[PDB]
């Protein structure tokens, strides 16, 4: 049996693999792959920046693809934004 | 509606609040609280480091607790490790 934290991380892994297995290297999310990822998995405040802008920022080692480690940058920024908004809703700030 | 990615993040947030709401400042996880988190939410290869060792690593500003930002360090390291180990055995 897995813990909720373990199942959450495996879910994030499955989301990445969903788009990394589309073509080419199995641990590479290419520009067009990331576009479909943003439109399907991400909310509007993430989408508005566009796939081209996100791809350029996420491609840390500049190899023309997004690996899982680079993908976590997007995941964490979403997590922070989600937590920040929920914190601002519980408190009438 | 919520995407699979959004739900996973909410679960992670819920996991942190589960231990931060125990006592004192509700936005802070203390040493005993972290030990509880590690023993309940984390796999063996993560636990083997030690609760005291993990706490010193996570409490980077040394205010005596792990806040949400510091907690994400653990989440990131666990995520990388889980992915790496999922492609083994
Ligand atoms: C609802 As809260 C513990 O993020 O202030
Ligand atoms: Ca690929
Ligand atoms: Ca890259
Ligand atoms: Ca607390
Ligand atoms: Ca701290
Ligand atoms: Cl950005
Ligand atoms: Cl609170
Ligand atoms: Cl908090
Ligand atoms: Cl592999
Ligand atoms: Zn919080
Ligand atoms: Zn609060
Ligand atoms: Zn506040
Ligand atoms: Zn993988």
Numbering used by the authors:
A (entry chain C): 1 to 93
B (entry chain A): 1 to 89
Paper quotes:
S100A8 and S100A9 constitute two of the most potent pro-inflammatory molecules among the S100 protein family. As for all their congeners, S100A8 and S100A9 form homodimers as a minimal, active unit. As for all S100 proteins, S100A8, S100A9, and their heterodimer bind two calcium ions per monomer, one in each EF-hand motif. Here we report the crystallographic structures of human S100A8 (hS100A8) bound to zinc and calcium at 2.2 and 2.1 Å, respectively.
Surprisingly, in the structure derived from crystal form 2, four zinc ions per homodimer were present in addition to the four calcium ions. A closer inspection of the structure revealed that only one of the two symmetrical Zn-sites found in crystal form 1 was strictly conserved (Zn2) whereas the second site (Zn1) was instead replaced by a (Zn)2-cacodylate complex, the cacodylate molecule coming from the crystallization condition. In this new site, Zn1 (crystal form 2) occupies almost the same position as Zn1 from crystal form 1 and is coordinated by His17 from monomer A and His83 from monomer B. The two other coordinating His residues are however replaced by a chloride ion and by one of the hydroxyl groups of the cacodylate molecule. Instead, His27 from monomer A and His87 from monomer B are flipped by 70 and 100°, respectively. As a consequence, His27 now coordinates the second Zn2+ (Zn3) from the (Zn)2-cacodylate complex which is further held in place by His91 from monomer B, by a second chloride ion and by the second hydroxyl group of the cacodylate molecule. Finally, the new position of His87 leads to the creation of a third Zn-site (Zn4) which is completed by Glu93 from the very C-terminal end of helix H4 (monomer B), Glu57 from a symmetry-related molecule, and a third chloride ion. Despite this quite large rearrangement of one of the Zn-sites in crystal form 2, the resulting S100A8 homodimer structure remains unaffected and superimposes well with the homodimer from crystal form 1, with an overall root-mean-square deviation (r.m.s.d.) on Cα atoms of 0.464 Å. Hence it seems possible to accommodate more than just one Zn2+ ion at the dimer interface within S100A8, and, in addition to the four conserved histidines from the canonical Zn-binding motif, other residues such as His91 or Glu93 can participate in zinc coordination. The most prominent changes are observed for the C-terminal part of helix H4, which even forms an additional helix turn in the model derived from crystal form 2. In crystal form 2, helix H4 only interacts with Glu57 from a symmetry-related molecule due to the presence of the (Zn)2-cacodylate complex.
